[PDB]
Amino acid sequence: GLSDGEWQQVLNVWGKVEADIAGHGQEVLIRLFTGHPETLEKFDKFKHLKTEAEMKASEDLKKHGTVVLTALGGILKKKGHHEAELKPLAQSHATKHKIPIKYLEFISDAIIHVLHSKHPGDFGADAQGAMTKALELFRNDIAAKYKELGFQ
Ligand code: HEM
């Protein structure tokens, strides 16, 4: 449950991401994969990436980063009214990709890390609070769908 002012902060922060969705998406995934190498194993199409240099050079990783952040941005712009947008992602990530909710926590924190890394001094405490709450809401609603599906 975010206030109007918190959603305003979220969407203000998101404008930073939308200016360079592929660069943000790439860095989010690289942060996820390098911080939590087990997550790489969930991607048949990225498990060949042995080094961060290879990850950085991967155009397909940037492409997927764009897909991920485009989806997330579409969800965030719903300001919590995202059941229709979230449902297929929860279902695909539980049933097809088999992504534990822990990895969604990892990527949520990776987003925060990337925002500070790319916008140092420009991702204020209020913005971090609002973005964190929005990612918690996202993760929590996914978690509810995971529970429905019995997925761990
Ligand atoms: C912000 C959180 C995430 C968003 C918005 C997101 C979004 C997406 C989207 C839109 C797709 C393609 C459509 C689909 O298959 O449903 C996808 C595919 C996929 N996602 Fe995610 N995802 C997120 C987090 C994760 C995490 C944390 C993992 C694993 C650690 C993961 C693993 C995968 C895999 C393996 C695929 C299939 C990739 C392929 O083979 O093309 N996702 N994701």
From Swiss-Prot:
GO terms for cellular component: sarcoplasm. GO terms for biological process: oxygen transport; removal of superoxide radicals. It comes from the Eukaryota. Keywords: Cytoplasm, Heme, Iron, Metal-binding, Muscle protein, Oxidoreductase, Oxygen transport, Phosphoprotein, Transport. Nitrite binds at H64. InterPro entries: Globin, Globin-like_sf, Myoglobin. Heme b binds at H93. Monomeric. Residues 1-147 form the Globin domain. O2 binds at H64. GO terms for molecular function: heme binding; metal ion binding; nitrite reductase activity; oxygen binding; oxygen carrier activity; peroxidase activity. It is found in: Cytoplasm, Sarcoplasm. It catalyses: Fe(III)-heme b-[protein] + nitric oxide + H2O = Fe(II)-heme b-[protein] + nitrite + 2 H(+); H2O2 + AH2 = A + 2 H2O. Belongs to the globin family. Gene3D superfamilies: 6.10.140.2100, 6.10.140.2110. Monomeric heme protein which primary function is to store oxygen and facilitate its diffusion within muscle tissues. Reversibly binds oxygen through a pentacoordinated heme iron and enables its timely and efficient release as needed during periods of heightened demand. Depending on the oxidative conditions of tissues and cells, and in addition to its ability to bind oxygen, it also has a nitrite reductase activity whereby it regulates the production of bioactive nitric oxide. Its EC number is 1.7.-.-, 1.11.1.-. Coiled coil: none annotated. The modification Phosphoserine is found at S3. This is Myoglobin.
